[PDB]
Structures are given as structure tokens and as C-alpha cells.
């Protein structure tokens, strides 16, 4: 029954002191310029990049106190400019508690080629999602080093993933896309979870999967996209209510806010479908419209919003505490 779990699960809501706590121990300035800036390279694919910005996150993650294994699921697959390696990054904690909340994002950059020396660095897409995780699990170090103490009073805990070759590398289809996640949802549904167990895969094992994804620019909108994860997208709503509220967030209005009522009318393809498609629960936080500087090279820092990142930090932040009951 416990697969069931996820259906009942309740978040453990901070109070006002809590949130203070949590909005002052997160630093948009370290995350720029620690988890960030080393990032804004070009990363498509076995480029130097690629590796560079797999060894830059599994560094900044062994580096912390928590109890993280790092693993790299490598892997070959045909491509339209050939036989190319993909890594995936996962980094959990507890790998054998039956239940993650996992939080994704894509850290491969999408090709283009040079013109007038420029390159194209996905600042949005999705460099500073890769510095919001990094930054999560640093400013929640302590709280989160908690989870390696054993007491029985629910068996969950937390999952990084860092999927490689999310973006196509010639025109977006069905085999020139999602390379990285669509390998690691196939071997996760092979895969027992716990170790021996008989029927439930590791599939079963994620709570929810909260993709973030194109985050970076001024004023995004992010609609509620599942009914399965509806409620709690709510939570985040509630949690950007809250922090405005009580004067934590910057540059933020109540009509600007980040988090929306309405839903979408389309299909977003992105990491999550291989996961999506097989039962997981989804929160796809990736807004709509796409950012202004989606897929051009004005993609960059330059145009990235500093308060806009910081606020919806505290936000996750927030949420990923009052999921694990920390
Ligand atoms: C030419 C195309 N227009 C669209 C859409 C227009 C309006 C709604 S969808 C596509 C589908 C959307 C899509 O392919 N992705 C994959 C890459 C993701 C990413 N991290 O860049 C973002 C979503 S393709
Ligand atoms: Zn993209």
C-alpha cells in the first residue's frame, strides 16, 4: 500500500517566524555567482561544456554536509549528428527510503551555431534552474543533513535530477528530444524499488516530480497544468501569498504574482512526459508564455531578473521544507 502514500501526503506549514528563517538563509548573490556564472557556457552534449557542468554540480553537491550519492546514469544513443554519450546527475538522499519528492531540470544547452561571436549559454534554459536546485541544497543543508537520523515516526526524503540532452539537436520530435529523461523514466520502470521488492518500481517511488524549467526572466506566469498535482501547485500559491504578505519577497505585487489560477490548453513536451506518461504525479513549473528570449541568444545573464529568481528560491524552498515536514 505504501505507493498509495503520496495520495494522503499532507505538507507541515511554517509558521511566520519559520518562513523568516527560511527567506534569510538563502543568498541570491552566492548562488550567482557559486552555482550560476560556471554554468552560463556552452553545454550541448559531449562539448567541454558538458563536462564542465556536470563536474561543476556533482562538486558543489559533495561539498555539503548531507548524506547525498551522486550517481551519473551514462548512456548511448543515436542522434541526427550521430552516436552521442548522455549523463544524467541524480543526487538523493536516502536512496533506499521507498519515497522522493524529486526536483528536475534539463542542464544540457540547446545548439546553435556561432554567428557574430555569440553563443548561445541557455541562461533560462536551464542554467538558472540547475542554480536554484544547487542553491536549495545548500541554503537547507542542516535541515536536510536531519533526514540521515533514522526514527520511525513517513519513508521519504529527497531526489535531484539533472537530466542531460533535453533539447533536440536538429527539429523537436519524438527521437530527437527528452534523451536523458526518456532513458532514465524507462530504466527507473525496470528497476525494483525498495532493493527485492516485488512489483513496485522505482517509479513508484516518486512522490512527485517538480520540473523546473525556462525560469529566469521578469514576470513569469506558471498555469496549474494536472489536476494530480493541482493541490499542490495551490501550496505554492499560498506560499507566494504568505511571503509577499509578510514583506520576504522583492520587487513582487500581488497582481504580478507568479503562480496562476488558470490552467493550459495545450501539451508542453518536456522532461516529464516519460515520466507523466507512466503515472507519475507532475508539477511542471515552467511558465507560459516562454520567456521573451526563448531559443535566441539574448538568452543570457544580461536578461535574467535577480529578484525574480531570489523570490521564487524562497518560495521552493519553502515548499520542499513543508513537503519533507522539516
Ligand atoms: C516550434 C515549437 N513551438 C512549440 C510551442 C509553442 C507554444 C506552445 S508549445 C513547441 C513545443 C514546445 C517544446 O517543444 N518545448 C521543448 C523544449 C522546452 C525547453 N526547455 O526549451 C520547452 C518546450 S516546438
Ligand atoms: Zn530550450
Redesign the pocket.
Known amino acids: 500500500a505504501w505507493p498509495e502514500e503520496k495520495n494522503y501526503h499532507q505538507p507541515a506549514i511554517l509558521n511566520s517566524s519559520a518562513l523568516r528563517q527560511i527567506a534569510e538563509g538563502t543568498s541570491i548573490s552566492e548562488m550567482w555567482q557559486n552555482d550560476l556564472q560556471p554554468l552560463l557556457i556552452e553545454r550541448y552534449p559531449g562539448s567541454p561544456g558538458s563536462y564542465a557542468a556536470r563536474q561543476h554540480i556533482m562538486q558543489r553537491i559533495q561539498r555539503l554536509q548531507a548524506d547525498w550519492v551522486l550517481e551519473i546514469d551514462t548512456f548511448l544513443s543515436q542522434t541526427p549528428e550521430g552516436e552521442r554519450s548522455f549523463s544524467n546527475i541524480i543526487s538523493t538522499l536516502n536512496p533506499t527510503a521507498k519515497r522522493h519528492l524529486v526536483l528536475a531540470c534539463?542542464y544540457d544547452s540547446?545548439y546553435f551555431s556561432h554567428w557574430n561571436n555569440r553563443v548561445f549559454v541557455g541562461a533560462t534554459?536551464?542554467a538558472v534552474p540547475c542554480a536554484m536546485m544547487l542553491e536549495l541544497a545548500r541554503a537547507l543543508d542542516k535541515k536536510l543533513l536531519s533526514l540521515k537520523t533514522v526514527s520511525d515516526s513517513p519513508d521519504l526524503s529527497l531526489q535531484l535530477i539533472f537530466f542531460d540532452g533535453?533539447?533536440?539537436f536538429l527539429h523537436?520530435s519524438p527521437q530527437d528530444?527528452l534523451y536523458g529523461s526518456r532513458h532514465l523514466a524507462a530504466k527507473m520502470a525496470s528497476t525494483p524499488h525498495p532493493p527485492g521488492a516485488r512489483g513496485t518500481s522505482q517509479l513508484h517511488g516518486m512522490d512527485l516530480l517538480v520540473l523546473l524549467?525556462?525560469i529566469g526572466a521578469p514576470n513569469p506566469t506558471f498555469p496549474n497544468f494536472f489536476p494530480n498535482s493541482a493541490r499542490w501547485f495551490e501550496r505554492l500559491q499560498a506560499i507566494e501569498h504568505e511571503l509577499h504578505e509578510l514583506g520576504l519577497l522583492k520587487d513582487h505585487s500581488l497582481e504580478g504574482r507568479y503562480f496562476q489560477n488558470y490552467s493550459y490548453g495545450?501539451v508542453?513536451?518536456?522532461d516529464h512526459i516519460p515520466f507523466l506518461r507512466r503515472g507519475v504525479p507532475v508539477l511542471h513549473l515552467?511558465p507560459?508564455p516562454?520567456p521573451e528570449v526563448?531559443?535566441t541568444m539574448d538568452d543570457n545573464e544580461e536578461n535574467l531578473d535577480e529578484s525574480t529568481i531570489d523570490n521564487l528560491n524562497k518560495i521552493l524552498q519553502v515548499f520542499v521544507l513543508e513537503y519533507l515536514h522539516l
Open positions: 534539463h540547446k534554459d536551464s533535453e533539447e533536440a523537436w528530444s524549467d525556462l495545450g508542453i513536451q518536456d515552467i507560459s516562454f526563448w531559443h
